[PDB]
Symmetry: C2
Subunit: 156 residues, 2 copies
């Protein structure tokens, strides 16, 4: 690793979680619309990481802001890079998380969030095939989470 390399500045960071319940259902957040006839796409509870702050703590805070649920990160799953049209790079971080016990889902309805909810493994497979999951990485990490927790893999 003593090989010379240059720094590739990353301007933005986002942090989110793949939160599963006892049945292996995954918690997703839905965007508010897209034509006016279609429903918004789904994504994992996530949000922006403040410059200089810990991404893991941000994942916990942002998840609560969107779903109203207090979560505990259990293990890092992965990070991936995206580039906006203008060249800005964003590094997204994803953790496997567990919800604290005794909580009721209470999504924060905003101009960006329609709602949030738990979706079963079978229904997620349908949503994915129907092109309703905003970022395909969600399926990659959900699969990792199911394996980590000892749940059956996604249908077919």
């Amino acid at each position: 690793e003593h090989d010379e390399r240059t720094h590739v500045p990353v301007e933005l960071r986002a942090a989110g979680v793949v939160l599963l319940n006892e049945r292996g259902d995954i918690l997703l957040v839905q965007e508010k619309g897209i034509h006016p006839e279609k429903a918004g796409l789904w994504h994992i509870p996530s949000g922006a990481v403040e410059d200089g702050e810990n991404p893991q703590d941000a994942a916990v805070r942002e998840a609560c802001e969107e779903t109203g649920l207090r979560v505990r990160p259990v293990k890092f799953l992965g990070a991936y890079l995206g580039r906006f049209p203008d060249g800005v790079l964003i590094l997204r971080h994803v953790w496997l998380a567990e919800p604290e016990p005794g909580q009721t889902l209470a999504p924060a309805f905003t101009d960006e969030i329609a709602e949030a909810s738990f979706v079963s493994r079978e229904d997620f497979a349908q949503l994915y095939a129907a092109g309703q999951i905003r970022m395909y990485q969600t399926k990659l990490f959900y699969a990792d989470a199911l394996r980590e927790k000892g749940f059956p893999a996604l249908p077919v």
Copy 2:
């Protein structure tokens, strides 16, 4: 986050740890030489992440391979991007870690590793100022670790 972006493929991933002992000393690994008169530079225990495997588990394994110490990741600190001369991108991941109790440091001497050892906060500051820390990010993360653990910040 519903804004369109493209994928920026990252070909290589590395995972390492900032491991501190009860006194706040940091565990570092030294490269084998550099002119033949100078000592190798120092870096955190780290190694390559296999394609498709969990970076956090890799951090634990690679740390043990270089230092002979079994470590437990306690919290994710950050990830950053580098680019090799040929254009290849490498994403380095860093975790704060704790060493399992009752262990003796036993570095793996190879053509790439001269040795490994715990360095105090004061001596790290000297090594850094003397340009002996391969990646400056090591100081950034050591500072984070000291704060997280409640230790005094690096000298001056």
